[PDB]
Amino acid sequence: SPLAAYEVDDSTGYLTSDVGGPIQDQTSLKAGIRGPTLLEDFMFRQKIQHFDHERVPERAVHARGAGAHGTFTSYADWSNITAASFLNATGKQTPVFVRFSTVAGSRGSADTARDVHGFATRFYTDEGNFDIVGANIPVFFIQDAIQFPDLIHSVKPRPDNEIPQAATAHDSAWDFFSQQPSTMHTLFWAMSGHGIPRSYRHMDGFGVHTFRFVKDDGSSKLIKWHFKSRQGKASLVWEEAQVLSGKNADFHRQDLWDAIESGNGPEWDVCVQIVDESQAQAFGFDLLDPTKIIPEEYAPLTKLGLLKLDRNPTNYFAETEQVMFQPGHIVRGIDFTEDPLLQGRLFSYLDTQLNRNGGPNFEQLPINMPRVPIHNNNRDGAGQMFIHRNKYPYTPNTLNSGYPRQANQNAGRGFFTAPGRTASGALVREVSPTFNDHWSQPRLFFNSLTPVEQQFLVNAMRFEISLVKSEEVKKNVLTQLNRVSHDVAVRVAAAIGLGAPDADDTYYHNNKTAGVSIVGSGPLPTIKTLRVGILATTSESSALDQAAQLRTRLEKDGLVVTVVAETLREGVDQTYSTADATGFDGVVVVDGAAALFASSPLFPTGRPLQIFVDAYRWGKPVGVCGSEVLDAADVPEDGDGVYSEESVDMFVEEFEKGLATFRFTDRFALDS
Amino acid sequence: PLAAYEVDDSTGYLTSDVGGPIQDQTSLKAGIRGPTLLEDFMFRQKIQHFDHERVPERAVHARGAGAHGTFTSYADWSNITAASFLNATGKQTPVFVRFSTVAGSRGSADTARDVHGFATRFYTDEGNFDIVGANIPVFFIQDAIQFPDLIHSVKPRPDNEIPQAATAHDSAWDFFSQQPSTMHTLFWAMSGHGIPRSYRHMDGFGVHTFRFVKDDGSSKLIKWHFKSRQGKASLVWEEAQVLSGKNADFHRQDLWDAIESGNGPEWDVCVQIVDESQAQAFGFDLLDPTKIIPEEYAPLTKLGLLKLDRNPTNYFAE
Amino acid sequence: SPLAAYEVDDSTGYLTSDVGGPIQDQTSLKAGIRGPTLLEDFMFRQKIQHFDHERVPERAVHARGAGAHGTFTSYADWSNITAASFLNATGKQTPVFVRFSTVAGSRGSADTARDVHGFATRFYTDEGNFDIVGANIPVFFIQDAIQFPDLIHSVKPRPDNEIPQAATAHDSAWDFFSQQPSTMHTLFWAMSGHGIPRSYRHMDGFGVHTFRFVKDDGSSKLIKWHFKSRQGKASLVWEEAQVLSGKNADFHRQDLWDAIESGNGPEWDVCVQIVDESQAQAFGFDLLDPTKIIPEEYAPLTKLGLLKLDRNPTNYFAETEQVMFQPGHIVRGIDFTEDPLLQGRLFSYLDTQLNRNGGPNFEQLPINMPRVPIHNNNRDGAGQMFIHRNKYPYTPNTLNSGYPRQANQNAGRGFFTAPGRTASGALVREVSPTFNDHWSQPRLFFNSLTPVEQQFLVNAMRFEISLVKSEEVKKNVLTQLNRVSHDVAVRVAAAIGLGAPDADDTYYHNNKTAGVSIVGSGPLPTIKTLRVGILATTSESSALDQAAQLRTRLEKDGLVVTVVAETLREGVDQTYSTADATGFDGVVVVDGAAALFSSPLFPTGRPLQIFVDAYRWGKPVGVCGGKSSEVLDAADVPEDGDGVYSEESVDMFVEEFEKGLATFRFTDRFALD
Numbered sequence A: 001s002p003l004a005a006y007e008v009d010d011s012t013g014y015l016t017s018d019v020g021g022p023i024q025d026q027t028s029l030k031a032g033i034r035g036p037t038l039l040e041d042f043m044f045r046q047k048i049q050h051f052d053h054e055r056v057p058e059r060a061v062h063a064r065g066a067g068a069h070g071t072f073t074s075y076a077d078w079s080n081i082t083a084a085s086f087l088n089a090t091g092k093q094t095p096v097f098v099r100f101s102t103v104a105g106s107r108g109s110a111d112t113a114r115d116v117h118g119f120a121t122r123f124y125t126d127e128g129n130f131d132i133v134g135a136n137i138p139v140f141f142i143q144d145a146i147q148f149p150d151l152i153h154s155v156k157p158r159p160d161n162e163i164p165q166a167a168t169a170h171d172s173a174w175d176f177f178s179q180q181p182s183t184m185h186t187l188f189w190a191m192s193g194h195g196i197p198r199s200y201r202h203m204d205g206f207g208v209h210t211f212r213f214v215k216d217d218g219s220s221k222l223i224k225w226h227f228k229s230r231q232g233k234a235s236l237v238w239e240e241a242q243v244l245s246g247k248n249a250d251f252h253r254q255d256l257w258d259a260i261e262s263g264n265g266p267e268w269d270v271c272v273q274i275v276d277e278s279q280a281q282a283f284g285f286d287l288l289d290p291t292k293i294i295p296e297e298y299a300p301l302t303k304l305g306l307l308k309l310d311r312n313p314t315n316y317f318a319e320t321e322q323v324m325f326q327p328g329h330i331v332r333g334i335d336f337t338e339d340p341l342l343q344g345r346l347f348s349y350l351d352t353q354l355n356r357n358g359g360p361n362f363e364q365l366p367i368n369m370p371r372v373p374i375h376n377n378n379r380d381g382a383g384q385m386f387i388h389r390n391k392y393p394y395t396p397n398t399l400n401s402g403y404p405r406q407a408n409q410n411a412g413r414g415f416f417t418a419p420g421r422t423a424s425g426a427l428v429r430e431v432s433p434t435f436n437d438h439w440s441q442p443r444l445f446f447n448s449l450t451p452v453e454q455q456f457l458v459n460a461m462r463f464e465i466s467l468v469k470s471e472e473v474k475k476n477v478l479t480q481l482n483r484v485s486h487d488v489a490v491r492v493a494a495a496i497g498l499g500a501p502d503a504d505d506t507y508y509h510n511n512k513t514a515g516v517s518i519v520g521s522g523p524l525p526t527i528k529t530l531r532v533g534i535l536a537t538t539s540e541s542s543a544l545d546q547a548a549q550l551r552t553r554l555e556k557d558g559l560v561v562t563v564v565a566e567t568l569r570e571g572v573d574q575t576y577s578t579a580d581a582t583g584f585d586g587v588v589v590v591d592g593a594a595a596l597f598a599s600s601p602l603f604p605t606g607r608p609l610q611i612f613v614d615a616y617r618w619g620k621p622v623g624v625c626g627s628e629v630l631d632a633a634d635v636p637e638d639g640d641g642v643y644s645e646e647s648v649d650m651f652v653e654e655f656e657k658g659l660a661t662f663r664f665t666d667r668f669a670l671d672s
Numbered sequence B: 001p002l003a004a005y006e007v008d009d010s011t012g013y014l015t016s017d018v019g020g021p022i023q024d025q026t027s028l029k030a031g032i033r034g035p036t037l038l039e040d041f042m043f044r045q046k047i048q049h050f051d052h053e054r055v056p057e058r059a060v061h062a063r064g065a066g067a068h069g070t071f072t073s074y075a076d077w078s079n080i081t082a083a084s085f086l087n088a089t090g091k092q093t094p095v096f097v098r099f100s101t102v103a104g105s106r107g108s109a110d111t112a113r114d115v116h117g118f119a120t121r122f123y124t125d126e127g128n129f130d131i132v133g134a135n136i137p138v139f140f141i142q143d144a145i146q147f148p149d150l151i152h153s154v155k156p157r158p159d160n161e162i163p164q165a166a167t168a169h170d171s172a173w174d175f176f177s178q179q180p181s182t183m184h185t186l187f188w189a190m191s192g193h194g195i196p197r198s199y200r201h202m203d204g205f206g207v208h209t210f211r212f213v214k215d216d217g218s219s220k221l222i223k224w225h226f227k228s229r230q231g232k233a234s235l236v237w238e239e240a241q242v243l244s245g246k247n248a249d250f251h252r253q254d255l256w257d258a259i260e261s262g263n264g265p266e267w268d269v270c271v272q273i274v275d276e277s278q279a280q281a282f283g284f285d286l287l288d289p290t291k292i293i294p295e296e297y298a299p300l301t302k303l304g305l306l307k308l309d310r311n312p313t314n315y316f317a318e
Numbered sequence C: 001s002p003l004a005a006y007e008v009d010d011s012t013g014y015l016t017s018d019v020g021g022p023i024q025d026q027t028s029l030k031a032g033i034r035g036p037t038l039l040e041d042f043m044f045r046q047k048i049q050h051f052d053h054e055r056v057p058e059r060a061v062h063a064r065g066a067g068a069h070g071t072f073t074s075y076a077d078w079s080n081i082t083a084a085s086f087l088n089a090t091g092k093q094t095p096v097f098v099r100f101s102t103v104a105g106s107r108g109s110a111d112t113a114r115d116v117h118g119f120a121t122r123f124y125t126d127e128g129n130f131d132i133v134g135a136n137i138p139v140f141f142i143q144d145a146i147q148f149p150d151l152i153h154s155v156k157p158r159p160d161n162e163i164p165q166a167a168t169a170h171d172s173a174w175d176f177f178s179q180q181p182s183t184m185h186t187l188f189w190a191m192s193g194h195g196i197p198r199s200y201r202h203m204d205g206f207g208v209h210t211f212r213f214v215k216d217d218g219s220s221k222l223i224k225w226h227f228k229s230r231q232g233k234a235s236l237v238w239e240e241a242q243v244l245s246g247k248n249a250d251f252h253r254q255d256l257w258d259a260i261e262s263g264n265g266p267e268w269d270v271c272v273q274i275v276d277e278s279q280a281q282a283f284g285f286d287l288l289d290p291t292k293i294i295p296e297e298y299a300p301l302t303k304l305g306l307l308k309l310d311r312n313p314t315n316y317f318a319e320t321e322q323v324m325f326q327p328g329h330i331v332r333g334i335d336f337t338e339d340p341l342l343q344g345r346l347f348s349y350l351d352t353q354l355n356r357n358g359g360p361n362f363e364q365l366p367i368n369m370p371r372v373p374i375h376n377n378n379r380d381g382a383g384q385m386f387i388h389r390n391k392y393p394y395t396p397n398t399l400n401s402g403y404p405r406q407a408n409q410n411a412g413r414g415f416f417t418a419p420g421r422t423a424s425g426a427l428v429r430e431v432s433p434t435f436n437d438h439w440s441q442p443r444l445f446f447n448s449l450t451p452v453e454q455q456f457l458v459n460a461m462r463f464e465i466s467l468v469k470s471e472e473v474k475k476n477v478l479t480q481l482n483r484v485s486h487d488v489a490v491r492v493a494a495a496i497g498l499g500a501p502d503a504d505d506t507y508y509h510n511n512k513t514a515g516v517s518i519v520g521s522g523p524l525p526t527i528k529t530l531r532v533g534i535l536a537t538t539s540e541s542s543a544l545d546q547a548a549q550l551r552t553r554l555e556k557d558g559l560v561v562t563v564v565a566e567t568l569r570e571g572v573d574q575t576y577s578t579a580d581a582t583g584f585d586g587v588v589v590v591d592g593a594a595a596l597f598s599s600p601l602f603p604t605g606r607p608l609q610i611f612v613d614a615y616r617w618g619k620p621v622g623v624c625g626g627k628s629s630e631v632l633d634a635a636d637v638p639e640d641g642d643g644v645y646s647e648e649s650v651d652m653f654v655e656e657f658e659k660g661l662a663t664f665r666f667t668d669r670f671a672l673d
């Protein structure tokens, strides 16, 4: 692997320059012990110059992200449906690297911003690198790639003052959304709990676009990729996401890192929906339109293989920061479609790597290299790392005996465009009328959420739109929401004191679809990796005792347990001063600690109780082991997802069921 | 002030960068549901610009915000310096100032605990003069060659890039404990100075000793102190953490709002002035940037007024 | 080959993208057979994007040059003068790479422009890469690095229209020279035959600056680097260099390439003049002044080892174009001096690579990699190839156990600055007055040339100065030349119609030094690789047999023979249409071909003109077969001239002609003032 070969060991040895000369790097060379630094200090300059040049431009979108290595294993020989080599035998294994991201934030912005998320997977196949550069959400904001800068400028900070960071909660974004109705579907996904997933591990992946699978005989079918999480899906609530941004801006990347270090590497079933070419407009919308999903009732999933992430990078810059994905990295057996969003994307990713890398040889970075030989006539360019032995790099040649040979459908396993694809008509800059329904699928989506999820979504909109200064933009927003659902527009307008416009039922209906709701998708299928905070005290040997015994029984099931006390000591992991409810999926107070919950120089006033109340209001399983304490909280002993038991075993057993349920949604007020 | 470079887009038709009127909402396709054409220059010039919008962030002080203002001299300071912007009572010079945290990337929160930069350009009639200063009057280290060691230790661990904008991790404290010069800046950073209420409520320092040089050749040693006229004020930690999440832009918004409401922040720009012969007279070395000269030993002389009163037009360009 | 690890083989296999996907690259994807090209065609865009970005900026100076790999072998254990590890044992071998170049011309400009030349050597030592970035001439134009852009602007093309390419023959250069008299020394070397060397292999190498040798005990001595050519020194004549520039702009790079390919890799003795610290001002001038040589009479050379170039690159762009030399690549045992031209160079070489490479990681290019492990805390930056395991890249640390360790004089074989070096005084932008004599050494140089060499030098000056438009500049030039030698100013003045000014004898003397004269360094020590052209004819079966016999005999002694005729056939290498006297060091006509001396197959008079040019440029020429007077009379070449040969016998002809090839140039054939 080109990664092993380029690993550099510094665990022994003397400091050297980049050209291998042993040196020191701690004192500048000076004329006299109190004199000025000398230009001839090469040691100073080579070190500072490296440091001066360490940064590269951040990605234009998806700048905040993290990745990991893993493996993809095919479940079957899929030759009946695609020629793709990585899919051509049962048990066939391919190395992968995945990077997850938000969209709008710059590289230091918080993981738990409300946003759409990237899910980019590189398969290093035996017939070349194949990238699926996908999302946590199956539909996108716009219908033509040429609009991407427009969308992105509106959602990124206003350019006079560069405010606000990583947020659609400002005028320009809502102006664009309200002026460009195609945005509604993704908008509804982004405003639901999908905008604030619990972790990268608890989100699906989607290729968004229709692609083709192409067989060796040249026949082809239309496909949508769906990466289906084995950890189940989960979100934060918004008041929790906000606090988390401040307390742990690295929440998602730490979650991914830690799960992999503990042998809980995340898994997804890689699936396709697969349909015939003739069904391009059969489902009541156009499969070239990336704002639409094919409901599962219309085309079920076929499982192809298992994606597992199971090793962290060695150097984040060299691997995560430098990985350069491109939908143009395609392999024989896969082909594009005439999705006008997909089509322009092919151009952008090849071009943008010149900006990041500063030079044309970016496919030579080790993370970008393939796992097979490279035979082509590309030459020179800044940062050329190969030494080519073919001095006759042109086709046709006889001087290198005609090598490299052309690869195509009938030679060298060449890529080939699906040979039934055709084009006809005028050369136009016109939008197909088949793309015009912007509102029926956002409605379908909303209809498919539970009542508490619908409320969350309305509340996300009320929160954002209330921060829009322009009263014109606010009214324009309500006009658009109203075409999806009168009821959403009445509820959102209540909060901003404007009147919804009159119901306009053109795009209304009652249809629902499966697999789009987080709460409706059940208890989590595993609670491993989930986090339990046990609030305890040093003033009481019984407290640390009860804590230790819970720890045993909770760590038993693969929960990450943190014991919190006023000060560190054996058995205590975190002080109250640094603890927060955003740090746990469940909070347990050991009754031995009743007294912290009625001042201290060691932590902010009311910190112990605040954690517990926060946890409760945000819907987490909370409880007391050993009561009265539930009074101090004002937390009802008979509420769902509130546990109080004298027995450790009965407590843990009930509490684990709470963890699976994950959120107690009865704690949230619904509109009338 | 930079009027001559401004570009007005409040009217007109869309053009290319070479003035050809064009559209930019739909790609050119072979047929209405067909593939996009390579000959669509409108599409490629637009996406190419977008693909190349970003430039590398600053290696340190990536997160920051800036504004235009005026420096007004209080006196004719020719008897201490030949510097021309300081040479007549009331003399006015345009400035631009950028404030910042040190360790976080672009996007990180304004109210991380950090040292802060306070950089001022004076566009003088004898050339640009820059004081690239700090909210804290002393720096962590005593030799420039050690800078990448400091910054690598305080920036996120390089295997996973965790934690963002925070000294709260092993590498940084390992460095602080092995490099005892760091103690002075460390104490200031751990105080309320690490979490100012606003850019307007902190002071600015040159940190280094410099020289003033007269037209006759004689010099003096000086430290620059910009003394805030808004007063000093800090957050408390627990509030700074919450604020970092509720409003990552808190200091830039504070500054921007103060200027738009007529409340542009002001500093008195001062120096401690001492003789060449005093370089070691105060019980430490004036060349040593981990040290202050206690005001008991050399009082501040006020040279002029710094007022920031104009927000930029384009954050990126400015 | 030392860079085998990075080689890419394309002698078999199917075309792929840079990411391994097999593809085609001959036809674009179109909507229909006569339709427009599709944006989705990634095969097209990856291929054209690469091509669109193949170029990097050429070097700011020395843009035009050529390189080869080789070996350095130490003749001894040099620990008695230096701690340098590549010099620590008899027969110790170190891979090198060397690049030779001109200075002013762009990429593409002609090898045989009149110029100073670069001679840059990398030693990939077991203690780090060490570069000697030197010259063919021992002295530089200017005494302070800060003046480099002024020198280079004045000698480069004028910036309104970019004329003239690779030439000092224009007003701005001579304005600079006349206003900046430190330039005189280097200017006299450039105007001599050293400005137009016969090949890279026939020139010497110089460090220019005084450096220090430092022993492991911290004592030091001052050194000058001299690389003495084992092929001998040889120049072209100006009228020939000019024709060559147009007939073969690749002359020196081809000469080098062919020499290595035929097993005749060029060699140099790498030497030093060594002197004590306390002799910095003992020789009549300042050793910190890069415009001065230590005459050999005062400090003899010590031979340190053998430099041999014996392997051409595989990819010119990857190896020669990308090699990035720096005097900052220094190794323990060597140190800098306070030469102000050297001091500033340290800065420029590190900085200019950011320009060429477009990013900070240029030392990771294969050609620039060291041959030993790298342990340091430099990280990230564009194009980062390494994946560093150490997650605590700062010092001091405990979390990586204090590694990498600091290296210095007493631990880890660290570089260290010579401990005896000091500075004292005010911080100044003043020139030392010890640097003020700009004229005595150019005069010393002029005196050590033979009378014909002196004529060539005067003629190079007349040629260039006559092309200066400005009469003021021309006057100002005679003023400076006049301070060197009244005689030079008189003789140049005559060409341009101006009086020389009155003798000014402050700096005149009659002193001479060894080893700076090309024409006085005796005959070449070897003639292998020298080029013999045999003019012959297809009309006569017997001319091709004389040519074959003559070929066989000459090739036996390692000479490169070209038979020329009207048309190619077995045994004929080149047509008259392509042949020129610049392609040969010697020209023989086989007397079966006397009749050629008009056709549709070559320009009128071409065969005769080859012989006449060869004679007029000082080459050995002759006629073989026994009947000579018809060729010789057509050419106006006297039968008894030195370097003119006629013999019936092949054996006898060659023995005499080979003496002429060693003499190389017959200087009796050029007029004197």
Ligand code: HDD
Residues within 6 Å of the ligand: A059, A060, A061, A062, A065, A099, A100, A101, A117, A118, A119, A120, A133, A134, A135, A140, A144, A145, A146, A148, A207, A208, A209, A290, A323, A324, A325, A341, A344, A345, A348, A349, A352, A353, B047, B050, B051
């Ligand atoms: C025409 C412009 C354009 C359009 C329409 C899109 N993108 Fe994109 N995308 C970019 C232009 C781009 C980019 C500017 O080219 C980026 C920035 C850095 C890079 O490598 O490419 C990028 C990066 C990028 C990344 C980060 C890859 C990584 O982790 O480095 C993901 C996951 C996506 N995009 C996903 C999408 C999805 C699911 C899209 C719509 C379905 C989409 N992009 C449309």
Ligand code: HDD
Residues within 6 Å of the ligand: A048, A051, A052, B058, B059, B060, B061, B064, B098, B099, B100, B116, B117, B118, B119, B132, B133, B134, B139, B143, B144, B145, B147, B206, B207, B208, B289
């Ligand atoms: C030799 C390395 C080094 C050392 C010892 C310092 N700095 Fe620095 N500084 C840089 C290297 C640097 C830099 C890498 O060159 C930066 C990053 C971006 C830039 O323009 O310069 C910079 C940026 C920078 C900025 C941001 C300016 C802006 O807003 O654009 C400020 C305020 C400072 N520095 C202030 C300081 C102070 C008060 C120092 C100690 C007295 C200090 N620096 C020591």
Ligand code: HDD
Residues within 6 Å of the ligand: C059, C060, C061, C062, C065, C099, C100, C101, C117, C118, C119, C120, C133, C134, C135, C140, C144, C145, C146, C148, C207, C208, C209, C290, C323, C324, C325, C341, C344, C345, C348, C349, C350, C352, C353
């Ligand atoms: C202050 C600037 C400066 C000064 C005073 C000099 N040079 Fe230089 N030289 C450069 C700045 C430079 C440079 C701009 O940095 C180059 C261009 C590309 C590079 O690598 O460095 C260079 C290239 C360069 C090369 C080409 C190396 C190669 O083949 O790649 C040689 C042989 C020399 N120089 C030799 C000299 C000699 C013998 C000098 C006087 C004794 C000299 N230089 C003074």
Ligand SMILES: [Ca+2]
Residues within 6 Å of the ligand: A158, A170, A171, A172, A173
């Ligand atoms: Ca806005």
Ligand SMILES: [Ca+2]
Residues within 6 Å of the ligand: B157, B169, B170, B171, B172
């Ligand atoms: Ca750490």
Ligand SMILES: [Ca+2]
Residues within 6 Å of the ligand: C158, C170, C171, C172, C173
């Ligand atoms: Ca000129």
